[PDB]
Structures are given as structure tokens and as C-alpha cells.
Amino acid sequence: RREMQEILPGLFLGPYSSAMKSKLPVLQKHGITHIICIRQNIEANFIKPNFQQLFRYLVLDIADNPVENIIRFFPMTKEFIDGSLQMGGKVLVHGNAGISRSAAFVIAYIMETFGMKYRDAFAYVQERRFCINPNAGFVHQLQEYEAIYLA
């Protein structure tokens, strides 16, 4: 729960603790080059980019609640992750707990890229990171985005 897991080749999912200063050796050993750092502005005291010069960041100001809009950022994060993986880079996606917001963004990537429905993508990720649980609003938005890209 307090560490990052490889979810699919080159894409890792973790809590904020996985991208703290002290974890640099772990990040470099796994060839991480890009980090999606997700947090509310009120969390920005402890959840923030810690390696200004070493990694490319995407910081997303997102609350973990069922009415928060995350679908607006699915195209952005898909592009960011594709861009890294295409150049042989690797991506860490982290939130606070690595349970709801961060998990939803990894699921969106998996659904679109690997042609999986929500239930199957959720199950796939849960097998790797046992604690994941996107809120219901996020689940609906995942389904809503699939309807978009399938149209």
C-alpha cells in the first residue's frame, strides 16, 4: 500500500510516498522518467514534484470525490503516457493513497489502449495493487469516456 507496483510494462501506480526524495534510487533503478503527480491544492504541502531536474512531471489538481471531473483530463494523460512509453521511458502515476484518483487514471489508459471494459480493467489492476477503489463518480466517468472513444 505504501509502495509502487508495475501495472503494465513501463507503467507504475503508487501512493505519494513512492516519489519522495528518499525514493530516488528506486525510481532510477526502474528507469522512471515521467511522473503524473495527482493531488488537491490543499495536499500540495506533502504531495508535489520532488525532483525538479530529473523527471518530467504532469501535476493534476484533482479532488477525490464523486462529483470531481476527471474525464476532462483523460486525453491529456493518455498523450503523456504514450509519449513517454514511445521513447522507451517509464511512467509513475501517483496520488495520495494510490487508491481512487490515481487508480482511475491508470484504468482509463488500460481501457483505451488494451481494449478492455471497466470491470476487466479494474480487475486486472486490483490483482496487482490490492487496495484500489475508484469512487463511483470516477467509475461512471471511466464508462462515459469509453462511450466517447468507441463512438
Swiss-Prot record:
A motif (Interaction with FBXW7) lies at residues 51-53. GO terms for cellular component: cytoplasm; cytosol; nucleoplasm; nucleus. The keyword Phosphoprotein applies. GO terms for biological process: negative regulation of protein binding; negative regulation of SCF-dependent proteasomal ubiquitin-dependent catabolic process; regulation of ERK1 and ERK2 cascade. It is found in: Nucleus; Cytoplasm, Cytosol. GO terms for molecular function: F-box domain binding; pseudophosphatase activity. The keyword Nucleus applies. Its main location: nucleus. Residues 3-151 form the Tyrosine-protein phosphatase domain. Disulfide bonds: none annotated. Keywords: Cytoplasm, Nucleus, Phosphoprotein. Belongs to the protein-tyrosine phosphatase family. Non-receptor class subfamily. Catalytically inactive phosphatase. Acts as a nuclear anchor for MAPK1/MAPK3 (ERK1/ERK2). Modulates cell-fate decisions and cell migration by spatiotemporal regulation of MAPK1/MAPK3 (ERK1/ERK2). By binding to the F-box of FBXW7, prevents the assembly of FBXW7 into the SCF E3 ubiquitin-protein ligase complex, and thereby inhibits degradation of its substrates. Plays a role in spermatogenesis. Interacts with MAPK1; independently of MAPK1 phosphorylation status. Interacts with CARHSP1/Crhsp-24. Interacts (via FQQ motif) with FBXW7 isoforms 1 (via F-box domain) and 3 (via F-box domain); the interaction is direct and prevents FBXW7 interaction with SKP1, a component of the SCF(FBXW7) complex. Does not interact with FBXW7 isoform 2. This is Serine/threonine/tyrosine-interacting protein. It comes from Homo sapiens. The lineage of its organism: Eukaryota, Metazoa, Chordata, Craniata, Vertebrata. The gene is STYX. The chain holds residues 26 to 176 of 223 of the full protein.
